[PDB]
Design a protein around this ligand. Sequence first.
Ligand SMILES: Nc1ncnc2c1ncn2[C@@H]1O[C@H](COP(=O)(O)OP(=O)(O)OP(=O)(O)O)[C@@H](O)[C@H]1O
Ligand SMILES: [Mg+2]
Ligand SMILES: [Zn+2]
Lengths: 165, 43, 612
Amino acid sequence: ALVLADNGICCIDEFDKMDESDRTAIHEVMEQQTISISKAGINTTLNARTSILAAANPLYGRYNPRLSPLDNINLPAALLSRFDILFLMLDIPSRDDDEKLAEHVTYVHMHNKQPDLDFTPVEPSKMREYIAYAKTKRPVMSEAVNDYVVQAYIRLRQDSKREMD
Amino acid sequence: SARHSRFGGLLSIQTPDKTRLTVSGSQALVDEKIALQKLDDSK
Amino acid sequence: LRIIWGTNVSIQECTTNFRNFLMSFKYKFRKILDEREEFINNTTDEELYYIKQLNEMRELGTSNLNLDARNLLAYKQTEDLYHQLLNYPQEVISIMDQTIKDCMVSLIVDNNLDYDLDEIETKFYKVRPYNVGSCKGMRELNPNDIDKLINLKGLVLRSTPVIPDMKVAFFKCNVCDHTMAVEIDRGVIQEPARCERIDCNEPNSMSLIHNRCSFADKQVIKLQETPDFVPDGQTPHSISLCVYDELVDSCRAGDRIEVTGTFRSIPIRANSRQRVLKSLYKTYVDVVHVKKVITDQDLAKIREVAAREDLYSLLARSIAPSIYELEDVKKGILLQLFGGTNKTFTKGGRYRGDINILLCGDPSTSKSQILQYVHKITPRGVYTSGKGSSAVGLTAYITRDVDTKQLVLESGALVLSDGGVCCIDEFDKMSDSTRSVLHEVMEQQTISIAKAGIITTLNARSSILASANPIGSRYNPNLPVTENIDLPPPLLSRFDLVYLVLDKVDEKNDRELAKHLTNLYDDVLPVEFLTMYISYAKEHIHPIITEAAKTELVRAYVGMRKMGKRITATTRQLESMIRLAEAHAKMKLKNVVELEDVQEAVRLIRSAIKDY
DNA sequence: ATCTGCTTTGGGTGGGTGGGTGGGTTGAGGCAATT
DNA sequence: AGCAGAT
Ligand SMILES: Nc1ncnc2c1ncn2[C@@H]1O[C@H](COP(=O)(O)OP(=O)(O)OP(=O)(O)O)[C@@H](O)[C@H]1O
Ligand SMILES: [Mg+2]
Ligand SMILES: [Zn+2]
């Protein structure tokens, strides 16, 4: 499945359950962006510059506020660090939000269509072609933006050290 | 023949009358005495 | 009159055309053909090309002549010859071979040279055309291309052992002991019905002496297409090749090669008993050409760089340019690459000249980068990660050949690094058995395996450059190195240098690192020069210790012991210091170890003992 | 030149004194070593 | 049914 995702985004569900062999495989992919096979029957090496999109559940099956995120996540800390963006989505009960979600799901079940009417969703084809066009492009950066990002980096490092305390 | 046995070069020799005989072998492709020798030997 | 079957082109005209092409042809014709006439010189382009190529071949004693197709299109005479080659490759190649031999003999005959003619008459001569048109795709090979010259670019995947292909059969009589050799045509033996001797005309008394026949080399290769030829990403297809004579073993598995051959097709028998053939024909390629895609001056350049006053920092910087502000680590790695002198001892055991370095610290810093760089530089070595199925394996292991269904002893990464650097990226996560074999290697420098009926020992004289990470999310200075590293004291005591690269949060340091990284979006040396220099020094130079070096070594060791009851240094540090001094002497290409070498070695070892 | 006679594919309507380096390859269950 | 052998 990873081969099919070469030069593309990979959709991995139930990431936490995965076996150590596949974990090592993805660890190799991220660091080296290469697929290597070493077998007597065949010896073929394929490059893999593919992105990974993972979904996982906490260690205990739900997030525990008492325990910090790191302990909640079973995966190695290095693997979490290698991720470009790590999103943590939680299910907090709430009267208003719960009512909205229930109304949405139930309308979908009764009518078989989107409930929202404030805005009209853009056609999928237009979005896909625009995404491809964006992938085709190539931006550039100057020195002033470099200085700005450098300053942001030192600020973030100081804040993160203070938090890690 | 320098090449291997299965290289597969085919010949067409022209008799004094307008008929063409078929011989196989690079040596035949080059020479005519060898072609006639092979013709005799293949009988 | 000789005419190729199914065509209306004479063989005699072809022979004379190619002979005229060979005896008279110049590169200037090719240059004007490709619209590069303005680049024509006055000496090389105006001199006969293939005559020179024949003369040099005769001087060297070789036979194969590499021919480029376009040169046929460059000469007015040979356009039809080029097209015929592309359409009837077999016969055209045959006439080309004979014309080459004929012109070779004619050169000596006309030039009345002293070179022996009998030797020339004995040689089989060949031509190897290449670049015969835009390379096609393995998926675009239709039946229209059967018996036609094609070009394929693909990745080798396997190659069978040499196959003995029969050329001339040998027969012997059972009542007269008379032998005569009969040639073969398309794999059929024209065995006689009776002896050719008039006196003994006995019939059906012929036997085939298998070991007195004549055989030629054949080999079957498997090819797979390049990644860029795959339209969507499906499984690449595979085509089979056949190579004869000097092209045998011309390419190893995993190579990218461009192959020129004749797309042939052969029937397959339904069974090994009758003559019935399947209607489906199997294809393959009959290859005729394959391409793969130190000097006094080098020695003089090496001496010139060696004489440079600032050689040390130069090599250190050149090892890994993209890394920032890790001078000590780079210097240690540079010493490791050269390696200390290796000692062959009588009345005493062998003393290893390798250097083992452990690059351990926080995950933020650059450590796999340095291992990758070292792998690139090293003349011999491997890259591996502990508990990594992708890697070949650190220990020799007995397996079964799937292709041949045979048992084969396969050497692991450590054995394949003999004389080189084996970089192990993930030293922390390792099987206990792997950590036992590593101990045996770093101690005895050999791996012993005694399983599956085999008792053998394999040399593993390889250095090690491993990397380690902390147990938690960061390195805690309060705790000792051993607790954080999660390695046995017996194991981390064996590394000659241990480097603690920590990402302590400092405004200045983070500022500089960020500036360097963003800018990435004092001369330096090319990697090829560095590896050649390292190989030259490692193969030729063997520094020796002296009385002054002997005094300084003893004094430094005693000083490093007296610092402590706590044992500051052990006799291991003495061996580390002597090895490091020897390596530093090697880097200067010096045959002797001076006070400066020992002093540099102590500075690195003492600093290494320092933060570690 | 004519008449007489055996054996396939591959498979259990040949077998286990022919074996598994002559191919028929997943599924279950027991055992040592690894845990 | 194709090929291997005896009259
Ligand atoms: N001079 C440098 N100093 C510190 N970090 C660097 C430097 N140059 C590059 N880096 C960072 O290090 C990364 C490469 O190192 P790498 O990710 O292999 O770290 P590691 O400590 O070897 O291992 P891990 O994979 O556990 O992080 C680069 O992507 C960059 O983020
Ligand atoms: Mg790393
Ligand atoms: Zn005889």
